[PDB]
Amino acid sequence: GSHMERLTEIFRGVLGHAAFGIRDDFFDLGGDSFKAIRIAAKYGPPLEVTDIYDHPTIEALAEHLEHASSSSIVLMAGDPATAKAVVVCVANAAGGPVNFVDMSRAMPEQASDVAMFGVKLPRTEVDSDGAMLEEVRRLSNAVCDDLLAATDLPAIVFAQANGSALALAITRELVRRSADVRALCIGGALMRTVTGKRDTRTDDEILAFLGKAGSTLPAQPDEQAFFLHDFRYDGWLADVYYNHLVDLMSRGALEVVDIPVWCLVGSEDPLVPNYPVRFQDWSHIGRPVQLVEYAGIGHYLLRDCPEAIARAVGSVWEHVSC
């Protein structure tokens, strides 16, 4: 029915109880990350997960929906009118712009000149690896189109682990169009040099992997279902694109871009513990390659030191300012 009526129905279904009003905070009574994703998915397209964080009440959220407006990116910090550069952020598997919330909230104090856009992951249904590669091309072109229509500022591409895959695509597209790309920043990932295997693991094996990486899996089976759908989809997409790039390398046909690459890694990351020798493999994509090492931190830099990641993005911009 109405905006607030659908919001109240979805909130009562997702939170557990019906004793809920339109002025109560979403987080002060059990709301979170997964529940916000589930809410944004059930409500429909025009609601984004970040709008629940900027508007954790049903009335304010419905007002936002009134003057709301489809884009492939979402503005998270700064304003392109006053800014000197923009940063396009791609999240890890099962993620999205939400992953950068904290980081965005640190940008005004760590990179005041830089605006932040987050890439939305539609997860379009496809029936083949070739269709998946066509979808990677379509999505990278959509992100580039929306970015070049949103701003004409120098652009930095930031990637979170698995998101690196899509990030690479975007960067390369932006070079084909001779757009103003000045840096590729990648967190908690390494360039893939060998053809990869497809993810045939069980849900429990994924839970163990995420425990090893330092993350817990949600308990609600619907939240788990959405998380695992997105996780396996993103893994498939990234595997396809990295295998394409590795084939290009095998034949010597991967062009090196004159764009610097920053590799931000936590020192205690159990997923890339061989980085001291492998981080330099980003030379296949761009040069020079710079390493920033965060001591005592694991894989999830955006969870454990988001302010420092904003600081790294500001540093990258000032390094490529002139």
Numbering used by the authors: 2656 to 2724, 2727 to 2979
Sentences copied from the publication:
Nonribosomal peptide synthetases (NRPSs) are responsible for the production of important biologically active peptides. The paradigm monobactam antibiotic sulfazecin is produced through the activity of a terminal thioesterase domain of SulM, which catalyzes an unusual β-lactam–forming reaction in which the nitrogen of the C-terminal N-sulfo-2,3-diaminopropionate residue attacks its thioester tether to release the monobactam product.
The PCP-TE structure was determined and refined to a resolution of 2.73 Å resolution. The structure contained two independent chains in the asymmetric unit, each containing residues Glu2660 through Cys2979. The two chains superimposed with a rms displacement of 0.4 Å over the full length of both domains, indicating that the orientation of the PCP relative to the thioesterase domain was the same in both chains. As such, the pantetheine is modeled as a free thiol. The complex is rotated ∼50° from the interface observed in the structure of EntF; however, both thioesterase domains direct the same face, the β2 strand, the helix that joins the β3 and β4 strands, and the lid helices towards the carrier protein and the trajectory of the pantetheine still allows a common approach to the active site.
